[PDB]
Amino acid sequence: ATNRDQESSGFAWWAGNARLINLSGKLLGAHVAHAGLIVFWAGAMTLFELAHFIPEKPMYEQGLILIPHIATLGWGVGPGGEVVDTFPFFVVGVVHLISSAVLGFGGVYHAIRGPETLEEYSSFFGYDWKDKNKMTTILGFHLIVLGIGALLLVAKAMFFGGLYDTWAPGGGDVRVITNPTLDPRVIFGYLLKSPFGGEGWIVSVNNLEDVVGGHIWIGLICIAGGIWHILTTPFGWARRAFIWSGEAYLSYSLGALSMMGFIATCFVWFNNTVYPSEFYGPTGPEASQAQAMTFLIRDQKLGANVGSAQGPTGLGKYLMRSPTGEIIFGGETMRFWDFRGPWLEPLRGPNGLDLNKIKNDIQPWQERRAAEYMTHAPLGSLNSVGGVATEINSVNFVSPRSWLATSHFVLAFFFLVGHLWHAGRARAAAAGFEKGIDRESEPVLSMPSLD
Amino acid sequence: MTILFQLALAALVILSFVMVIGVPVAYASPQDWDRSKQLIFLGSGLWIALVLVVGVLNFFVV
Amino acid sequence: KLPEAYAIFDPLVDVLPVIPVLFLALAFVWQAAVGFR
Amino acid sequence: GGRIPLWIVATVAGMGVIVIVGLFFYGAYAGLGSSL
Protein backbone atom coordinates (compact mmCIF):
# COMPACT_ATOMS: atom_id res chain seq x y z
CA ALA A 1 0.00 0.00 0.00
CA THR A 2 2.84 2.38 -1.07
CA ASN A 3 1.74 5.93 -0.01
CA ARG A 4 -1.92 4.81 0.51
CA ASP A 5 -2.62 6.28 3.95
CA GLN A 6 -2.26 9.64 5.65
CA GLU A 7 0.71 8.60 7.80
CA SER A 8 2.83 7.67 4.76
CA SER A 9 1.65 10.23 2.24
CA GLY A 10 0.90 13.24 4.42
CA PHE A 11 -2.52 13.58 2.68
CA ALA A 12 -5.87 12.62 4.12
CA TRP A 13 -8.26 10.35 2.18
CA TRP A 14 -10.35 13.33 0.92
CA ALA A 15 -7.23 14.70 -0.67
CA GLY A 16 -6.21 11.15 -1.70
CA ASN A 17 -5.40 11.94 -5.29
CA ALA A 18 -2.64 14.31 -4.12
CA ARG A 19 -0.86 11.04 -3.10
CA LEU A 20 -0.24 10.66 -6.83
CA ILE A 21 1.87 13.74 -7.49
CA ASN A 22 5.19 11.82 -7.71
CA LEU A 23 3.91 8.38 -8.83
CA SER A 24 3.93 8.81 -12.60
CA GLY A 25 2.58 5.29 -13.37
CA LYS A 26 -0.45 5.35 -11.14
CA LEU A 27 -1.01 9.02 -12.13
CA LEU A 28 -0.92 8.02 -15.81
CA GLY A 29 -3.55 5.37 -14.87
CA ALA A 30 -5.80 8.04 -13.27
CA HIS A 31 -5.47 10.16 -16.40
CA VAL A 32 -6.21 7.42 -18.90
CA ALA A 33 -9.07 5.98 -16.85
CA HIS A 34 -10.47 9.58 -16.74
CA ALA A 35 -10.26 10.05 -20.48
CA GLY A 36 -12.23 6.76 -20.71
CA LEU A 37 -14.99 8.33 -18.53
CA ILE A 38 -15.19 11.28 -20.94
CA VAL A 39 -15.22 9.10 -24.05
CA PHE A 40 -17.66 6.78 -22.28
CA TRP A 41 -20.15 9.57 -21.58
CA ALA A 42 -19.86 10.86 -25.14
CA GLY A 43 -20.73 7.43 -26.59
CA ALA A 44 -23.41 6.43 -24.06
CA MET A 45 -25.06 9.89 -24.11
CA THR A 46 -25.18 9.86 -27.94
CA LEU A 47 -26.84 6.44 -28.03
CA PHE A 48 -29.29 7.54 -25.39
CA GLU A 49 -30.11 10.74 -27.38
CA LEU A 50 -30.51 8.63 -30.54
CA ALA A 51 -32.79 6.06 -28.82
CA HIS A 52 -35.03 8.89 -27.68
CA PHE A 53 -34.86 10.86 -30.92
CA ILE A 54 -38.01 11.51 -33.02
CA PRO A 55 -36.52 12.78 -36.32
CA GLU A 56 -39.46 14.99 -37.30
CA LYS A 57 -39.50 17.09 -34.06
CA PRO A 58 -36.82 19.74 -33.80
CA MET A 59 -33.73 18.57 -31.92
CA TYR A 60 -34.18 21.47 -29.57
CA GLU A 61 -37.58 20.16 -28.46
CA GLN A 62 -35.86 16.92 -27.40
CA GLY A 63 -33.23 17.74 -24.80
CA LEU A 64 -30.41 17.01 -27.22
CA ILE A 65 -26.92 18.46 -26.92
CA LEU A 66 -24.75 15.88 -28.69
CA ILE A 67 -26.76 15.10 -31.81
CA PRO A 68 -26.71 18.89 -32.54
CA HIS A 69 -22.87 18.80 -32.35
CA ILE A 70 -22.79 15.96 -34.87
CA ALA A 71 -25.36 17.59 -37.22
CA THR A 72 -23.38 20.88 -37.28
CA LEU A 73 -20.42 18.93 -38.73
CA GLY A 74 -22.87 18.14 -41.58
CA TRP A 75 -23.54 14.48 -40.65
CA GLY A 76 -27.11 13.20 -40.88
CA VAL A 77 -28.77 16.38 -42.11
CA GLY A 78 -30.02 18.07 -45.26
CA PRO A 79 -31.58 21.43 -46.26
CA GLY A 80 -33.11 23.40 -43.34
CA GLY A 81 -31.46 20.95 -40.91
CA GLU A 82 -33.91 18.21 -41.87
CA VAL A 83 -32.61 14.85 -40.55
CA VAL A 84 -32.04 12.58 -43.54
CA ASP A 85 -30.03 9.73 -41.90
CA THR A 86 -29.52 8.87 -38.21
CA PHE A 87 -26.81 6.29 -38.99
CA PRO A 88 -23.91 8.80 -38.57
CA PHE A 89 -25.24 9.62 -35.08
CA PHE A 90 -25.21 5.90 -34.36
CA VAL A 91 -21.64 5.49 -35.61
CA VAL A 92 -20.35 8.37 -33.48
CA GLY A 93 -22.05 7.01 -30.40
CA VAL A 94 -20.84 3.42 -30.93
CA VAL A 95 -17.24 4.26 -31.82
CA HIS A 96 -16.84 6.39 -28.63
CA LEU A 97 -18.47 3.77 -26.45
CA ILE A 98 -16.18 1.02 -27.84
CA SER A 99 -13.15 3.32 -27.58
CA SER A 100 -13.86 4.05 -23.91
CA ALA A 101 -13.46 0.35 -23.00
CA VAL A 102 -9.90 0.47 -24.44
CA LEU A 103 -9.03 3.66 -22.57
CA GLY A 104 -10.70 2.24 -19.46
CA PHE A 105 -8.59 -0.91 -19.90
CA GLY A 106 -5.35 1.19 -20.06
CA GLY A 107 -6.41 3.22 -17.03
CA VAL A 108 -7.21 0.24 -14.84
CA TYR A 109 -3.93 -1.44 -15.92
CA HIS A 110 -1.70 1.57 -15.14
CA ALA A 111 -3.53 2.49 -12.02
CA ILE A 112 -3.71 -0.94 -10.44
CA ARG A 113 -1.24 -3.39 -12.15
CA GLY A 114 1.47 -1.44 -13.98
CA PRO A 115 4.65 0.11 -12.48
CA GLU A 116 3.62 2.79 -9.93
CA THR A 117 6.46 4.98 -11.11
CA LEU A 118 7.70 5.00 -14.70
CA GLU A 119 11.20 6.52 -14.25
CA GLU A 120 13.12 3.28 -13.48
CA TYR A 121 11.23 1.52 -16.25
CA SER A 122 11.55 4.20 -18.98
CA SER A 123 13.24 7.53 -19.38
CA PHE A 124 11.04 8.50 -22.33
CA PHE A 125 7.80 7.97 -20.31
CA GLY A 126 9.11 8.75 -16.76
CA TYR A 127 9.22 12.42 -15.68
CA ASP A 128 10.12 14.78 -12.91
CA TRP A 129 7.84 17.86 -12.61
CA LYS A 130 10.94 20.02 -12.03
CA ASP A 131 12.49 18.85 -15.27
CA LYS A 132 11.63 21.87 -17.34
CA ASN A 133 12.83 20.21 -20.53
CA LYS A 134 10.70 17.04 -20.21
CA MET A 135 7.68 19.21 -19.23
CA THR A 136 7.84 21.37 -22.41
CA THR A 137 8.47 18.22 -24.46
CA ILE A 138 5.28 16.47 -23.23
CA LEU A 139 3.49 19.81 -23.69
CA GLY A 140 4.83 19.88 -27.26
CA PHE A 141 3.52 16.35 -28.07
CA HIS A 142 0.04 17.40 -26.87
CA LEU A 143 0.23 20.59 -28.90
CA ILE A 144 0.86 18.56 -32.07
CA VAL A 145 -2.12 16.26 -31.26
CA LEU A 146 -4.38 19.31 -30.76
CA GLY A 147 -3.06 20.83 -34.00
CA ILE A 148 -4.00 17.64 -35.87
CA GLY A 149 -7.48 17.68 -34.21
CA ALA A 150 -8.09 21.26 -35.51
CA LEU A 151 -7.00 20.14 -38.99
CA LEU A 152 -9.45 17.21 -38.84
CA LEU A 153 -12.19 19.83 -38.65
CA VAL A 154 -10.72 21.53 -41.71
CA ALA A 155 -10.55 18.10 -43.43
CA LYS A 156 -14.27 17.48 -42.71
CA ALA A 157 -15.30 20.93 -43.99
CA MET A 158 -13.15 20.92 -47.16
CA PHE A 159 -12.70 17.26 -48.29
CA PHE A 160 -15.24 15.14 -46.48
CA GLY A 161 -18.66 16.59 -47.20
CA GLY A 162 -18.61 20.07 -45.62
CA LEU A 163 -20.40 21.54 -42.59
CA TYR A 164 -23.93 22.59 -41.93
CA ASP A 165 -24.22 26.21 -43.02
CA THR A 166 -27.21 28.13 -41.59
CA TRP A 167 -26.24 31.04 -43.86
CA ALA A 168 -26.23 29.07 -47.15
CA PRO A 169 -27.86 31.21 -49.84
CA GLY A 170 -31.39 29.96 -50.53
CA GLY A 171 -31.57 28.39 -47.05
CA GLY A 172 -29.59 26.46 -44.47
CA ASP A 173 -27.73 23.43 -45.94
CA VAL A 174 -24.55 21.37 -45.73
CA ARG A 175 -21.88 23.09 -47.82
CA VAL A 176 -18.34 22.25 -48.79
CA ILE A 177 -15.90 25.03 -47.87
CA THR A 178 -13.53 25.64 -50.75
CA ASN A 179 -12.30 29.15 -50.05
CA PRO A 180 -11.32 29.21 -46.33
CA THR A 181 -10.17 32.58 -44.94
CA LEU A 182 -6.40 32.68 -44.78
CA ASP A 183 -5.82 36.45 -44.45
CA PRO A 184 -4.29 36.99 -40.99
CA ARG A 185 -5.80 40.51 -40.89
CA VAL A 186 -9.29 38.89 -40.76
CA ILE A 187 -8.37 35.84 -38.66
CA PHE A 188 -6.39 37.68 -36.01
CA GLY A 189 -8.61 40.76 -36.33
CA TYR A 190 -11.29 38.74 -34.48
CA LEU A 191 -8.97 38.43 -31.46
CA LEU A 192 -8.74 42.21 -31.15
CA LYS A 193 -12.50 42.87 -31.44
CA SER A 194 -14.15 44.34 -28.37
CA PRO A 195 -16.17 41.73 -26.33
CA PHE A 196 -18.95 44.37 -25.85
CA GLY A 197 -22.24 44.77 -27.70
CA GLY A 198 -22.23 44.85 -31.52
CA GLU A 199 -18.63 43.55 -31.52
CA GLY A 200 -18.55 40.28 -29.53
CA TRP A 201 -14.85 39.39 -29.89
CA ILE A 202 -14.47 35.86 -31.30
CA VAL A 203 -18.13 35.00 -30.53
CA SER A 204 -19.01 37.25 -33.48
CA VAL A 205 -17.70 34.74 -36.12
CA ASN A 206 -20.54 34.69 -38.64
CA ASN A 207 -19.41 32.52 -41.64
CA LEU A 208 -17.85 29.13 -42.12
CA GLU A 209 -14.95 30.42 -44.29
CA ASP A 210 -13.58 32.29 -41.20
CA VAL A 211 -14.32 29.33 -38.97
CA VAL A 212 -12.40 26.93 -41.30
CA GLY A 213 -9.53 29.36 -41.95
CA GLY A 214 -9.11 29.95 -38.24
CA HIS A 215 -8.62 26.24 -37.59
CA ILE A 216 -6.10 26.12 -40.44
CA TRP A 217 -4.17 28.82 -38.53
CA ILE A 218 -4.74 27.17 -35.19
CA GLY A 219 -3.68 23.72 -36.44
CA LEU A 220 -0.45 25.18 -37.88
CA ILE A 221 0.21 27.29 -34.79
CA CYS A 222 -0.28 24.31 -32.51
CA ILE A 223 1.96 22.01 -34.58
CA ALA A 224 4.71 24.67 -34.91
CA GLY A 225 4.49 25.49 -31.23
CA GLY A 226 4.61 21.81 -30.33
CA ILE A 227 7.80 21.38 -32.40
CA TRP A 228 9.18 24.52 -30.72
CA HIS A 229 8.61 23.05 -27.27
CA ILE A 230 10.12 19.71 -28.13
CA LEU A 231 13.24 21.53 -29.41
CA THR A 232 13.67 24.19 -26.69
CA THR A 233 13.95 24.69 -22.92
CA PRO A 234 12.22 27.57 -21.15
CA PHE A 235 13.96 30.98 -21.42
CA GLY A 236 15.43 32.61 -18.32
CA TRP A 237 12.63 35.12 -17.90
CA ALA A 238 10.15 32.22 -18.11
CA ARG A 239 12.08 30.32 -15.46
CA ARG A 240 11.93 33.34 -13.15
CA ALA A 241 8.26 34.11 -13.69
CA PHE A 242 6.73 30.67 -12.96
CA ILE A 243 6.45 28.10 -10.25
CA TRP A 244 7.74 24.73 -11.60
CA SER A 245 5.75 21.97 -9.88
CA GLY A 246 2.95 19.51 -10.71
CA GLU A 247 0.40 21.52 -8.60
CA ALA A 248 1.49 24.77 -10.26
CA TYR A 249 0.99 23.28 -13.72
CA LEU A 250 -2.39 21.93 -12.72
CA SER A 251 -3.25 25.49 -11.63
CA TYR A 252 -2.25 27.14 -14.94
CA SER A 253 -4.45 24.62 -16.78
CA LEU A 254 -7.36 25.22 -14.31
CA GLY A 255 -7.23 28.97 -15.08
CA ALA A 256 -7.15 28.26 -18.82
CA LEU A 257 -10.09 25.82 -18.71
CA SER A 258 -12.02 28.38 -16.56
CA MET A 259 -11.46 31.02 -19.21
CA MET A 260 -12.43 28.62 -21.97
CA GLY A 261 -15.55 27.63 -20.03
CA PHE A 262 -16.69 31.26 -19.88
CA ILE A 263 -15.99 31.70 -23.55
CA ALA A 264 -18.05 28.57 -24.46
CA THR A 265 -20.95 29.87 -22.33
CA CYS A 266 -21.09 33.11 -24.36
CA PHE A 267 -20.54 31.19 -27.60
CA VAL A 268 -23.65 28.98 -27.17
CA TRP A 269 -25.67 31.90 -25.82
CA PHE A 270 -25.06 34.33 -28.70
CA ASN A 271 -23.58 32.53 -31.70
CA ASN A 272 -25.96 30.95 -34.26
CA THR A 273 -23.28 30.00 -36.86
CA VAL A 274 -21.36 27.20 -35.09
CA TYR A 275 -24.45 26.60 -32.94
CA PRO A 276 -27.06 26.62 -35.72
CA SER A 277 -30.49 27.62 -34.38
CA GLU A 278 -32.02 24.82 -36.55
CA PHE A 279 -30.44 22.42 -34.04
CA TYR A 280 -29.89 24.34 -30.80
CA GLY A 281 -33.05 26.52 -30.78
CA PRO A 282 -33.07 30.31 -31.23
CA THR A 283 -30.70 32.48 -29.16
CA GLY A 284 -32.29 34.72 -26.49
CA PRO A 285 -31.72 37.85 -28.74
CA GLU A 286 -33.10 35.91 -31.72
CA ALA A 287 -36.38 34.85 -30.03
CA SER A 288 -36.97 38.37 -28.69
CA GLN A 289 -36.43 39.85 -32.19
CA ALA A 290 -38.65 37.06 -33.66
CA GLN A 291 -41.44 38.20 -31.39
CA ALA A 292 -41.33 41.78 -32.66
CA MET A 293 -41.18 40.42 -36.25
CA THR A 294 -44.19 38.23 -35.54
CA PHE A 295 -46.37 41.09 -34.40
CA LEU A 296 -45.10 43.49 -37.06
CA ILE A 297 -46.15 40.82 -39.63
CA ARG A 298 -49.51 40.24 -37.93
CA ASP A 299 -50.53 43.84 -37.44
CA GLN A 300 -49.33 44.96 -40.84
CA LYS A 301 -51.50 42.11 -42.29
CA LEU A 302 -54.35 43.74 -40.39
CA GLY A 303 -53.56 47.05 -42.08
CA ALA A 304 -51.22 48.82 -39.68
CA ASN A 305 -48.63 51.17 -41.12
CA VAL A 306 -45.74 49.85 -39.04
CA GLY A 307 -43.26 52.59 -39.99
CA SER A 308 -45.41 55.39 -38.67
CA ALA A 309 -47.00 53.62 -35.67
CA GLN A 310 -45.94 55.59 -32.58
CA GLY A 311 -45.98 53.48 -29.39
CA PRO A 312 -47.05 54.63 -25.90
CA THR A 313 -43.53 56.03 -25.06
CA GLY A 314 -43.23 58.10 -28.29
CA LEU A 315 -40.76 55.55 -29.74
CA GLY A 316 -42.10 53.49 -32.66
CA LYS A 317 -44.20 50.51 -31.52
CA TYR A 318 -42.58 48.21 -34.23
CA LEU A 319 -39.62 50.16 -35.60
CA MET A 320 -37.22 52.74 -34.14
CA ARG A 321 -33.58 53.88 -34.48
CA SER A 322 -30.55 52.46 -32.76
CA PRO A 323 -28.31 55.03 -30.98
CA THR A 324 -26.31 55.28 -34.33
CA GLY A 325 -29.43 55.62 -36.52
CA GLU A 326 -30.00 52.09 -37.94
CA ILE A 327 -33.67 51.01 -38.23
CA ILE A 328 -34.31 48.30 -35.61
CA PHE A 329 -37.24 46.54 -33.95
CA GLY A 330 -38.86 48.45 -31.10
CA GLY A 331 -40.17 47.56 -27.68
CA GLU A 332 -37.78 45.89 -25.25
CA THR A 333 -35.95 44.13 -28.04
CA MET A 334 -34.25 47.43 -28.85
CA ARG A 335 -31.45 45.92 -26.74
CA PHE A 336 -31.06 43.07 -29.26
CA TRP A 337 -30.57 45.06 -32.45
CA ASP A 338 -27.01 43.54 -32.85
CA PHE A 339 -28.76 40.23 -33.55
CA ARG A 340 -28.26 38.72 -37.05
CA GLY A 341 -29.86 35.58 -38.47
CA PRO A 342 -30.76 34.07 -41.87
CA TRP A 343 -34.51 34.62 -41.56
CA LEU A 344 -34.06 38.35 -40.82
CA GLU A 345 -31.14 39.50 -43.01
CA PRO A 346 -33.23 39.58 -46.25
CA LEU A 347 -35.14 42.49 -44.67
CA ARG A 348 -32.01 44.50 -43.80
CA GLY A 349 -30.64 47.24 -46.09
CA PRO A 350 -27.64 49.58 -45.75
CA ASN A 351 -29.66 51.70 -43.24
CA GLY A 352 -30.89 48.74 -41.18
CA LEU A 353 -34.36 47.21 -41.45
CA ASP A 354 -35.89 48.30 -44.74
CA LEU A 355 -39.46 49.48 -44.63
CA ASN A 356 -40.16 48.72 -48.28
CA LYS A 357 -38.80 45.19 -47.94
CA ILE A 358 -40.92 44.90 -44.74
CA LYS A 359 -44.09 46.07 -46.48
CA ASN A 360 -43.63 43.91 -49.61
CA ASP A 361 -41.15 41.10 -49.24
CA ILE A 362 -41.78 39.17 -46.07
CA GLN A 363 -42.11 35.53 -47.18
CA PRO A 364 -44.25 32.86 -45.41
CA TRP A 365 -41.08 31.00 -44.42
CA GLN A 366 -39.91 34.07 -42.51
CA GLU A 367 -43.25 34.36 -40.68
CA ARG A 368 -43.05 30.66 -39.77
CA ARG A 369 -39.47 30.82 -38.54
CA ALA A 370 -40.16 33.98 -36.52
CA ALA A 371 -43.25 32.31 -34.87
CA GLU A 372 -41.25 29.07 -34.18
CA TYR A 373 -38.36 31.10 -32.61
CA MET A 374 -40.61 33.41 -30.56
CA THR A 375 -42.32 30.29 -29.10
CA HIS A 376 -39.05 28.47 -28.43
CA ALA A 377 -37.32 31.29 -26.61
CA PRO A 378 -34.68 29.92 -24.27
CA LEU A 379 -36.70 30.51 -21.05
CA GLY A 380 -37.99 27.62 -18.87
CA SER A 381 -37.96 26.11 -15.36
CA LEU A 382 -35.43 23.70 -13.81
CA ASN A 383 -38.08 20.93 -14.10
CA SER A 384 -38.34 21.80 -17.84
CA VAL A 385 -41.59 23.72 -18.01
CA GLY A 386 -41.08 25.89 -21.02
CA GLY A 387 -42.12 29.51 -20.84
CA VAL A 388 -41.85 32.55 -18.57
CA ALA A 389 -41.76 31.86 -14.84
CA THR A 390 -45.52 32.34 -14.44
CA GLU A 391 -46.41 29.89 -17.26
CA ILE A 392 -48.76 26.95 -16.43
CA ASN A 393 -47.54 23.37 -16.91
CA SER A 394 -48.02 21.94 -20.47
CA VAL A 395 -44.93 22.53 -22.58
CA ASN A 396 -41.94 20.37 -21.67
CA PHE A 397 -39.09 22.60 -22.88
CA VAL A 398 -35.74 24.06 -21.75
CA SER A 399 -33.55 25.18 -24.63
CA PRO A 400 -30.27 23.32 -25.25
CA ARG A 401 -28.70 26.84 -25.22
CA SER A 402 -29.73 27.37 -21.57
CA TRP A 403 -28.56 23.95 -20.55
CA LEU A 404 -25.22 24.39 -22.24
CA ALA A 405 -24.63 28.03 -21.05
CA THR A 406 -25.63 27.41 -17.45
CA SER A 407 -23.68 24.19 -17.09
CA HIS A 408 -20.54 25.75 -18.54
CA PHE A 409 -20.79 28.82 -16.40
CA VAL A 410 -21.01 26.64 -13.29
CA LEU A 411 -18.00 24.58 -14.44
CA ALA A 412 -15.96 27.64 -15.51
CA PHE A 413 -16.64 29.29 -12.18
CA PHE A 414 -15.64 26.34 -10.01
CA PHE A 415 -12.54 25.99 -12.29
CA LEU A 416 -11.59 29.56 -11.42
CA VAL A 417 -11.93 28.64 -7.81
CA GLY A 418 -9.71 25.58 -8.29
CA HIS A 419 -7.17 27.74 -10.10
CA LEU A 420 -6.94 30.09 -7.09
CA TRP A 421 -6.88 27.14 -4.71
CA HIS A 422 -4.04 25.38 -6.48
CA ALA A 423 -2.08 28.40 -7.68
CA GLY A 424 -1.95 29.72 -4.10
CA ARG A 425 -1.20 26.30 -2.67
CA ALA A 426 1.64 25.82 -5.28
CA ARG A 427 3.22 29.15 -4.34
CA ALA A 428 3.05 28.34 -0.64
CA ALA A 429 4.40 24.78 -0.96
CA ALA A 430 7.22 25.96 -3.27
CA ALA A 431 8.26 28.52 -0.62
CA GLY A 432 7.79 25.95 2.15
CA PHE A 433 4.89 27.28 4.24
CA GLU A 434 1.83 25.34 2.98
CA LYS A 435 1.51 23.39 6.28
CA GLY A 436 1.46 26.43 8.50
CA ILE A 437 3.71 29.05 10.08
CA ASP A 438 6.93 27.96 11.84
CA ARG A 439 6.29 28.93 15.50
CA GLU A 440 9.98 29.81 16.03
CA SER A 441 10.39 31.47 12.62
CA GLU A 442 7.13 33.47 12.34
CA PRO A 443 7.94 36.05 9.64
CA VAL A 444 5.70 38.85 11.07
CA LEU A 445 7.56 38.75 14.37
CA SER A 446 10.74 39.79 12.39
CA MET A 447 9.04 42.74 10.79
CA PRO A 448 8.77 46.29 12.06
CA SER A 449 5.41 47.36 13.56
CA LEU A 450 2.98 49.14 11.25
CA ASP A 451 2.55 51.92 13.81
CA MET B 1 -27.86 -13.15 -40.16
CA THR B 2 -30.07 -11.95 -37.27
CA ILE B 3 -29.65 -15.03 -35.04
CA LEU B 4 -25.89 -14.71 -35.56
CA PHE B 5 -25.86 -10.88 -35.07
CA GLN B 6 -27.98 -11.03 -31.93
CA LEU B 7 -26.01 -13.80 -30.31
CA ALA B 8 -22.78 -12.02 -31.16
CA LEU B 9 -24.08 -8.80 -29.53
CA ALA B 10 -25.49 -10.52 -26.41
CA ALA B 11 -22.13 -12.36 -26.15
CA LEU B 12 -20.25 -9.02 -26.38
CA VAL B 13 -22.54 -7.56 -23.73
CA ILE B 14 -22.04 -10.58 -21.45
CA LEU B 15 -18.23 -10.86 -21.90
CA SER B 16 -18.05 -7.10 -21.18
CA PHE B 17 -19.85 -7.52 -17.87
CA VAL B 18 -17.51 -10.42 -17.05
CA MET B 19 -14.35 -8.41 -17.96
CA VAL B 20 -15.70 -5.37 -16.02
CA ILE B 21 -15.69 -7.44 -12.79
CA GLY B 22 -12.81 -9.78 -13.61
CA VAL B 23 -10.04 -7.50 -14.88
CA PRO B 24 -9.77 -5.34 -11.68
CA VAL B 25 -10.25 -8.40 -9.42
CA ALA B 26 -7.46 -10.30 -11.32
CA TYR B 27 -5.15 -7.25 -11.27
CA ALA B 28 -5.46 -6.69 -7.52
CA SER B 29 -5.46 -10.36 -6.58
CA PRO B 30 -2.46 -11.87 -4.79
CA GLN B 31 -2.83 -15.48 -5.91
CA ASP B 32 -3.68 -16.50 -9.45
CA TRP B 33 -1.77 -13.99 -11.53
CA ASP B 34 -0.66 -16.68 -14.04
CA ARG B 35 -4.12 -18.22 -14.64
CA SER B 36 -5.60 -14.67 -14.77
CA LYS B 37 -3.09 -13.05 -17.15
CA GLN B 38 -3.92 -15.73 -19.69
CA LEU B 39 -7.72 -15.36 -19.35
CA ILE B 40 -7.48 -11.54 -19.52
CA PHE B 41 -5.55 -11.91 -22.82
CA LEU B 42 -8.15 -14.38 -24.16
CA GLY B 43 -11.16 -12.33 -22.98
CA SER B 44 -9.55 -9.30 -24.69
CA GLY B 45 -8.82 -10.85 -28.10
CA LEU B 46 -12.29 -12.32 -27.93
CA TRP B 47 -13.85 -8.96 -26.98
CA ILE B 48 -12.16 -7.33 -29.95
CA ALA B 49 -13.28 -10.10 -32.35
CA LEU B 50 -16.92 -9.82 -31.21
CA VAL B 51 -16.85 -6.06 -31.71
CA LEU B 52 -15.70 -6.55 -35.32
CA VAL B 53 -18.25 -9.34 -35.82
CA VAL B 54 -21.08 -7.11 -34.55
CA GLY B 55 -19.71 -4.27 -36.70
CA VAL B 56 -19.76 -6.40 -39.86
CA LEU B 57 -23.08 -8.16 -39.20
CA ASN B 58 -24.62 -4.75 -38.56
CA PHE B 59 -24.86 -4.15 -42.28
CA PHE B 60 -26.66 -7.45 -42.94
CA VAL B 61 -29.33 -6.61 -40.37
CA VAL B 62 -29.85 -2.80 -40.73
CA LYS C 1 -34.67 5.55 -32.19
CA LEU C 2 -31.89 2.96 -32.55
CA PRO C 3 -31.88 0.87 -35.75
CA GLU C 4 -34.54 -1.82 -35.11
CA ALA C 5 -32.00 -4.70 -34.90
CA TYR C 6 -30.70 -3.10 -31.64
CA ALA C 7 -34.17 -2.30 -30.15
CA ILE C 8 -33.93 -5.18 -27.65
CA PHE C 9 -31.05 -3.25 -26.09
CA ASP C 10 -33.14 -0.03 -25.56
CA PRO C 11 -33.49 -0.50 -21.79
CA LEU C 12 -29.75 -1.04 -21.40
CA VAL C 13 -29.04 2.08 -23.53
CA ASP C 14 -31.38 4.07 -21.22
CA VAL C 15 -29.19 3.36 -18.20
CA LEU C 16 -25.60 3.57 -19.56
CA PRO C 17 -25.11 7.40 -19.45
CA VAL C 18 -25.34 7.33 -15.65
CA ILE C 19 -22.38 4.90 -15.27
CA PRO C 20 -19.85 7.73 -14.81
CA VAL C 21 -21.75 8.85 -11.70
CA LEU C 22 -21.36 5.30 -10.37
CA PHE C 23 -17.53 5.53 -10.62
CA LEU C 24 -17.52 8.53 -8.26
CA ALA C 25 -19.75 6.68 -5.79
CA LEU C 26 -17.43 3.64 -6.19
CA ALA C 27 -14.44 5.62 -4.86
CA PHE C 28 -16.39 6.00 -1.62
CA VAL C 29 -17.27 2.28 -1.33
CA TRP C 30 -13.57 1.48 -1.82
CA GLN C 31 -12.46 4.04 0.73
CA ALA C 32 -15.00 2.75 3.20
CA ALA C 33 -13.46 -0.73 2.62
CA VAL C 34 -9.93 0.57 3.42
CA GLY C 35 -11.23 2.55 6.40
CA PHE C 36 -10.50 5.96 4.78
CA ARG C 37 -6.88 5.61 5.91
CA GLY D 1 -19.04 -6.83 18.20
CA GLY D 2 -19.13 -6.79 14.40
CA ARG D 3 -19.67 -9.53 11.78
CA ILE D 4 -21.09 -7.55 8.84
CA PRO D 5 -18.37 -5.07 7.69
CA LEU D 6 -19.38 -1.41 8.23
CA TRP D 7 -18.53 -0.53 4.59
CA ILE D 8 -21.16 -3.04 3.34
CA VAL D 9 -23.84 -1.69 5.76
CA ALA D 10 -23.07 1.86 4.52
CA THR D 11 -23.14 0.85 0.82
CA VAL D 12 -26.41 -1.10 1.12
CA ALA D 13 -27.90 1.66 3.27
CA GLY D 14 -26.79 4.40 0.86
CA MET D 15 -28.20 2.42 -2.10
CA GLY D 16 -31.49 2.06 -0.25
CA VAL D 17 -31.63 5.85 0.21
CA ILE D 18 -30.99 6.38 -3.53
CA VAL D 19 -33.78 3.92 -4.48
CA ILE D 20 -36.47 5.50 -2.31
CA VAL D 21 -35.54 9.08 -3.36
CA GLY D 22 -35.40 7.88 -6.97
CA LEU D 23 -38.90 6.53 -6.54
CA PHE D 24 -39.99 9.93 -5.17
CA PHE D 25 -38.57 11.67 -8.28
CA TYR D 26 -40.27 9.13 -10.56
CA GLY D 27 -43.53 10.05 -8.83
CA ALA D 28 -43.04 13.78 -9.71
CA TYR D 29 -43.66 12.72 -13.31
CA ALA D 30 -46.48 10.19 -12.88
CA GLY D 31 -49.86 10.15 -11.08
CA LEU D 32 -50.75 12.88 -8.58
CA GLY D 33 -48.53 15.99 -8.74
CA SER D 34 -47.45 15.25 -12.29
CA SER D 35 -49.49 18.13 -13.85
CA LEU D 36 -51.04 15.57 -16.26
Binding site: - | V25, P30 | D14, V29, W30, A33 | I8
Partner: peptide, 29 residues
Protein backbone atom coordinates in the same frame (compact mmCIF):
# COMPACT_ATOMS: atom_id res chain seq x y z
CA UNK E 1 -39.77 -0.04 -16.05
CA UNK E 2 -38.70 -3.68 -15.21
CA UNK E 3 -36.13 -4.11 -18.02
CA UNK E 4 -34.28 -0.84 -17.22
CA UNK E 5 -34.49 -1.51 -13.44
CA UNK E 6 -32.84 -4.95 -13.86
CA UNK E 7 -30.07 -3.43 -16.05
CA UNK E 8 -29.31 -0.67 -13.50
CA UNK E 9 -29.48 -3.35 -10.76
CA UNK E 10 -26.62 -5.44 -12.18
CA UNK E 11 -24.62 -2.45 -13.41
CA UNK E 12 -24.98 -0.98 -9.91
CA UNK E 13 -23.90 -4.16 -8.07
CA UNK E 14 -20.79 -4.58 -10.30
CA UNK E 15 -18.77 -1.85 -8.51
CA UNK E 16 -19.37 -3.02 -4.94
CA UNK E 17 -19.06 -6.66 -6.14
CA UNK E 18 -15.44 -5.91 -7.23
CA UNK E 19 -14.68 -4.46 -3.79
CA UNK E 20 -16.30 -7.41 -2.10
CA UNK E 21 -14.47 -10.09 -4.10
CA UNK E 22 -11.12 -8.30 -3.46
CA UNK E 23 -11.81 -7.93 0.31
CA UNK E 24 -12.74 -11.64 0.64
CA UNK E 25 -9.53 -12.54 -1.25
CA UNK E 26 -7.37 -10.10 0.77
CA UNK E 27 -6.56 -8.33 -2.53
CA UNK E 28 -4.51 -5.18 -3.12
CA UNK E 29 -7.21 -2.60 -2.17
Amino acid sequence: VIAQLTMIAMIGIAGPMIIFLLAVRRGNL
